[PDB]
Amino acid sequence: AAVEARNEDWMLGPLAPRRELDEITLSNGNFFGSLSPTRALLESEVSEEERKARVAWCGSPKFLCIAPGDRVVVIEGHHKDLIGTIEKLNTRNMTVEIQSEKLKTNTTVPQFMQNDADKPVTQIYARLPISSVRLVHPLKDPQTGEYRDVIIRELRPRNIVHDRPTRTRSMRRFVPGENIIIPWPKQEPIKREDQPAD
Amino acid sequence: PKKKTSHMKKRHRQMAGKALKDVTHLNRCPACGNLKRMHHLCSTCLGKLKGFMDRNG
Amino acid sequence: PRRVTPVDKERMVGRWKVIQKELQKRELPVLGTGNHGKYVELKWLGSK
Amino acid sequence: PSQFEVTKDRKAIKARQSKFLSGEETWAPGKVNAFLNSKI
Amino acid sequence: WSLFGWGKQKVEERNKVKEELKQSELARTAAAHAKDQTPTGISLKKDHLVRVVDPDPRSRVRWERKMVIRKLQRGTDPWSVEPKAERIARTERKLVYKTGYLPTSVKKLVHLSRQIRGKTVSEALVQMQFSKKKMAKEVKTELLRAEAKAIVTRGMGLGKAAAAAAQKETGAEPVKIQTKDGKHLEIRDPTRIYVAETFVNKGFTRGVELDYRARGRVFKMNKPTTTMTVVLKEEKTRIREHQERVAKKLRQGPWVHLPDRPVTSQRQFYSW
Amino acid sequence: NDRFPPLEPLPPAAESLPSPLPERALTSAKLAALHARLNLSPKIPLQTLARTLVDASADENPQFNNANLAFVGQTLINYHIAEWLLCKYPRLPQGILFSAMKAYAGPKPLLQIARSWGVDTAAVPGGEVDPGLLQFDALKPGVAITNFGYKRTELAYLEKFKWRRGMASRVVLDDDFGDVVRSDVSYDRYGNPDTRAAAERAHAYFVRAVVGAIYAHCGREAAKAFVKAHIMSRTLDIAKLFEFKYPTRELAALCAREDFEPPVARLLSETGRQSRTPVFVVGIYSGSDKLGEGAASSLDHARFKAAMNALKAWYLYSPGENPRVPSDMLEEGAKPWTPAYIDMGEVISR
RNA sequence: AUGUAUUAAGGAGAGUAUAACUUAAUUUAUGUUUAUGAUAGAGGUUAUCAACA
RNA sequence: AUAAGCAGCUCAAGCAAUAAGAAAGCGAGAGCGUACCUUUUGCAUAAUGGGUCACCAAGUUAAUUUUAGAUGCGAGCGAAU
RNA sequence: GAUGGGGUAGCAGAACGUUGAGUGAAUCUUAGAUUUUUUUUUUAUAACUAAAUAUAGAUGAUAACUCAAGUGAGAAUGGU
Ligand SMILES: [K+]
Ligand SMILES: [Mg+2]
Ligand SMILES: [Mg+2]
Ligand SMILES: [Mg+2]
Ligand SMILES: [Mg+2]
Ligand SMILES: [Mg+2]
Ligand SMILES: [Mg+2]
Ligand SMILES: [Mg+2]
Ligand SMILES: [Mg+2]
Ligand SMILES: [Mg+2]
Ligand SMILES: [Mg+2]
Ligand SMILES: [Mg+2]
Ligand SMILES: [Mg+2]
Ligand SMILES: [Zn+2]
């Protein structure tokens, strides 16, 4: 559709259509310039050899070395070289949500979960795969001692230790080649409460 | 049939004198002005007047 | 010594020096593919 | 096609049609069909 | 959010998507900021469309380089002329509309497309309202949708008020043309929409019925669905095509009594 | 870059010059082939043929441009055709003479002589282009050569108010073809009827320049042979440049002027009268002599056509196909000159 | 398809956390090594973020 | 829209490019020409076969025994240590 | 100023094309490799020129010579 929309803007000139005021495409049911929830949230399941490829640069699907709360830099797509903080971390598709206003994108809301006065299209935060983002952490200049931000291209787990009675583990992430142990981001534990039925 | 009818001899049978005729006997309705067939009653005014005589009488 | 490319032909005619100005004035990529990257819409969905 | 329930996208194209025909708004060429660098 | 996953999840998961949509509507809320959105909610900001309107900027950029080099190879040539196809696209509006899948056949609907061909949209709608065919009611609905697209998307049919002035305020003489078929028309509004072209195509198979004949024989009957395409144009296309036919008739020269016909046999001697 | 080194070694200050340098013409394969295509003598170096291809619109300098060669060439081409046309058809009307001079040495035929030599034009003038291409600037409006004709005081009125110009003043006031005298950049555009004129002008000036270089290097006699071989060898049906208004009246003034008895139209033959396509053959006879004959479908048209054929025969009188030219005398010793026929002029009638 | 190695009883019905399999249909423990592996965090359903024996 | 074409071939008017240059295509009109295959002494044959198009669909492999050409060794050759 | 020229059954010679393979960890490709089209040229079952559309850096295409065949279809009341 973009291959034909650009040839018309070239040819028609001052008669270029107003495609934003057009009806939906009955093939997929989307409006002009809007994605679909399945394609804007990246909730489509991926193969197991894909999850290992998306996480290849940061450990493995079961030893992931990136956590929510740590700033990352985008390295793919239109919004390249963008920097934001990870809000969510979907470990099923290996997709990450960055709550930046530049990653928003129109999406068509299905009418089975929308009132009759609500606008059909809304702007939601689009998610990215883990492979499309690298870690940004401030390091110290060994020559001058000045702190500056750098992009971490690879992470690997270190000092892994399991606790069989509790089925837990605690490891450390470091930068291969330079051996810079990067501390984990401040993660708040889930709030556990005592219910009346317990 | 002995042979298959060609594209020419089948197109003659289908469209030569079998073009749909445009209805030209259309007049407006005096009460409302809507287009109706000639010598015929308006379908939108018939129902409305037919329903207007059922409520009050 | 080397293959004559469509770029070489235009330089001989004289048209190339004008093309560099237009492409540069429009922010288009002269003799390149620019800083833009490969299509990733299908790659992000897990396409193989 | 005559029996399909008109959706929200078909109801907004009928309000624009009556706004252009009436004369309230003036039609103008589209500006978001494609992001070309020529802008002509 | 699928229709079969919306009920397979707990309320907490569902009630977490509503706060996402709710918080998305507080940022969307006088004139400069209210014109960046359509009534359907489509945000007309570049960053929000770049992912759909410009999915492949690496290929669009190179294609736009192909058209700029091809445009400078013509501006250099002193003998170049704008192609006839490039000059009409930027001067004459056009809308190609493909209807939905109609439950009929091609040999039935073909006669309903030849009836509205060449007629104006207003003339064609009056013939679908008073036709006896069952598919004429569907062609009247699909012709109203195409007209809405033409007026809104393409801008056609929006010059009436201006044209009505010249005819009456200035007592101007309207244009008189003759269609390719030969019908004489008198065009007072050159923006009037009409049905330039129209053709019917065949779609998927609606269904399959079984025909139980004698001797335990069965035959398959395919239920057909079909579509129609309408190419809507303004009356400026017919006023241009008529001037071309008239110019081609005044360019063939007049009829001469004694023409100079060629002798097409060459022989290596004189016969006179 | 490193993978694509430049095909032609050139200094960095070469894409800015208006035209390639003179020494660049000594390394181009297009000039060496163009020089050998026209069989030019080795007296004309390649640095001179290159100058002929640089139009004055690509270079404002008087040197490096066609301005001076194209002038010296136009004078020779015009003079050699003028004398040859007057010796071949001594009775041509002056308006037809202008049309026939323009039919041989005009911008239209000279554009075809340049295209028959395999002369490819350059897109835009620049120092980088090889000197073997005809380079000119078609977007510059004011480029023109110097002519002998003067500007008319009433030029504005003639165009605006349709004033009358005449055909006896055109010889002095106007140019050699009778026409009146003085009648950054963006390449996102299309051709123009004004640019097409500049394209015709550039080609004509080049063909004229080649004759200017032949004259300077090889001398007068070499230029005359070049014009005689490439320009005068073209064929033209001068009988097709005639347009008559009231020919029957003009033919009557002719016989009256020459003292011939009045012309009488006689019906030599006819067939198919009272039909859709009749044929009438009428012959115009001055006394017993038959001046001209014409056949047409209408009796009146046949009489008009017969009168035109008689007038064309008067004007298209040729002593010979290859007549002697007054220019044949100034060269090496030739036979004494014999006076050529001088006609009074075309008849002026009602 | 051939070769190598190992082994020497097979199927169905119904039910079940729809990768997980038998009304317990995701049981419970050991040892070792855990990024220099093997081939100093968050996470018990927002689960099974660990493989081998 | 006055015509009795296996729709090809030979001859060919004319139409066809807004513009310098550039005519593919369609073709009136004249003539020549009774599809293909199989099977037969012989088929336009009213003898057999085929609605159209796409795809699938037939002298191959093994052992054995020969011949020609080329080439290795040579009253030895090949095989094998 | 060489000689020769229809052809069924049949016999013989010489080639092209298709698929896969070796040389190949080779050559070429956003300065456009590849695009079932169109077009141009060459004694031409074939390749080539150009044009138009799309956009690939190799799970891409490829000359030349060679190797092996599930290798060439208007014909089987053939089959899908
Ligand atoms: K076979
Ligand atoms: Mg822990
Ligand atoms: Mg039965
Ligand atoms: Mg007839
Ligand atoms: Mg028999
Ligand atoms: Mg028969
Ligand atoms: Mg038969
Ligand atoms: Mg049959
Ligand atoms: Mg086969
Ligand atoms: Mg013979
Ligand atoms: Mg033979
Ligand atoms: Mg292609
Ligand atoms: Mg078959
Ligand atoms: Zn009424």
From Swiss-Prot, chain A:
GO terms for cellular component: mitochondrion; ribosome. One of its GO terms (molecular function) is structural constituent of ribosome. One of its GO terms (biological process) is translation. The keyword Metal-binding does not apply. Keywords: Mitochondrion. It comes from the Eukaryota. It is found in: Mitochondrion. Belongs to the universal ribosomal protein uL24 family. Component of the mitochondrial ribosome (mitoribosome), a dedicated translation machinery responsible for the synthesis of mitochondrial genome-encoded proteins, including at least some of the essential transmembrane subunits of the mitochondrial respiratory chain. The mitoribosomes are attached to the mitochondrial inner membrane and translation products are cotranslationally integrated into the membrane. Component of the mitochondrial large ribosomal subunit (mt-LSU). Mature N.crassa 74S mitochondrial ribosomes consist of a small (37S) and a large (54S) subunit. The 37S small subunit contains a 16S ribosomal RNA (16S mt-rRNA) and 32 different proteins. The 54S large subunit contains a 23S rRNA (23S mt-rRNA) and 42 different proteins. uL24m forms the wall of the exit tunnel. This is Large ribosomal subunit protein uL24m. It comes from Neurospora crassa (strain ATCC 24698 / 74-OR23-1A / CBS 708.71 / DSM 1257 / FGSC 987). The chain holds residues 51 to 248 of 396 of the full protein.
From Swiss-Prot, chain D:
Disulfide bonds: none annotated. It is found in: Mitochondrion. Belongs to the universal ribosomal protein uL23 family. Component of the mitochondrial large ribosomal subunit (mt-LSU). Mature N.crassa 74S mitochondrial ribosomes consist of a small (37S) and a large (54S) subunit. The 37S small subunit contains a 16S ribosomal RNA (16S mt-rRNA) and 32 different proteins. The 54S large subunit contains a 23S rRNA (23S mt-rRNA) and 42 different proteins. uL23m forms the wall of the exit tunnel. Component of the mitochondrial ribosome (mitoribosome), a dedicated translation machinery responsible for the synthesis of mitochondrial genome-encoded proteins, including at least some of the essential transmembrane subunits of the mitochondrial respiratory chain. The mitoribosomes are attached to the mitochondrial inner membrane and translation products are cotranslationally integrated into the membrane. This is Large ribosomal subunit protein uL23m.
Swiss-Prot record, chain E:
Disulfide bonds: none annotated. It is found in: Mitochondrion. Coiled coil: none annotated. Gene3D superfamilies: Ribosomal protein L22/L17 (3.90.470.10). GO terms for cellular component: large ribosomal subunit; mitochondrion. GO terms for biological process: translation. Signal peptide: none annotated. Its main location: mitochondrion. Keywords: Mitochondrion, Ribonucleoprotein, Ribosomal protein. InterPro entries: Ribosomal_uL22, Ribosomal_uL22_bac/org-type, Ribosomal_uL22_sf. Pfam families: Ribosomal_L22. One of its GO terms (molecular function) is structural constituent of ribosome. Component of the mitochondrial large ribosomal subunit (mt-LSU). Mature N.crassa 74S mitochondrial ribosomes consist of a small (37S) and a large (54S) subunit. The 37S small subunit contains a 16S ribosomal RNA (16S mt-rRNA) and 32 different proteins. The 54S large subunit contains a 23S rRNA (23S mt-rRNA) and 42 different proteins. uL22m forms the wall of the exit tunnel. Belongs to the universal ribosomal protein uL22 family. PANTHER family: CHLOROPLAST 50S RIBOSOMAL PROTEIN L22-RELATED, LARGE RIBOSOMAL SUBUNIT PROTEIN UL22M. Component of the mitochondrial ribosome (mitoribosome), a dedicated translation machinery responsible for the synthesis of mitochondrial genome-encoded proteins, including at least some of the essential transmembrane subunits of the mitochondrial respiratory chain. The mitoribosomes are attached to the mitochondrial inner membrane and translation products are cotranslationally integrated into the membrane. This is Large ribosomal subunit protein uL22m.
Swiss-Prot record, chain F:
The gene is mrpl3. It is found in: Mitochondrion. PANTHER family: LARGE RIBOSOMAL SUBUNIT PROTEIN ML44 (PTHR11207:SF32), RIBONUCLEASE III (PTHR11207). One of its GO terms (molecular function) is double-stranded RNA binding. Its main location: mitochondrion. One of its GO terms (biological process) is RNA processing. InterPro entries: dsRBD_dom (IPR014720), Ribosomal_mL44_DSRM_fung (IPR044443), RNase_III_dom (IPR000999), RNase_III_sf (IPR036389). Belongs to the ribonuclease III family. Mitochondrion-specific ribosomal protein mL44 subfamily. Keywords: Mitochondrion, Ribonucleoprotein, Ribosomal protein, RNA-binding. Component of the mitochondrial ribosome (mitoribosome), a dedicated translation machinery responsible for the synthesis of mitochondrial genome-encoded proteins, including at least some of the essential transmembrane subunits of the mitochondrial respiratory chain. The mitoribosomes are attached to the mitochondrial inner membrane and translation products are cotranslationally integrated into the membrane. The keyword Cell membrane does not apply. This is Large ribosomal subunit protein mL44. One of its GO terms (cellular component) is ribosome. The lineage of its organism: Eukaryota, Fungi, Dikarya, Ascomycota, Pezizomycotina.
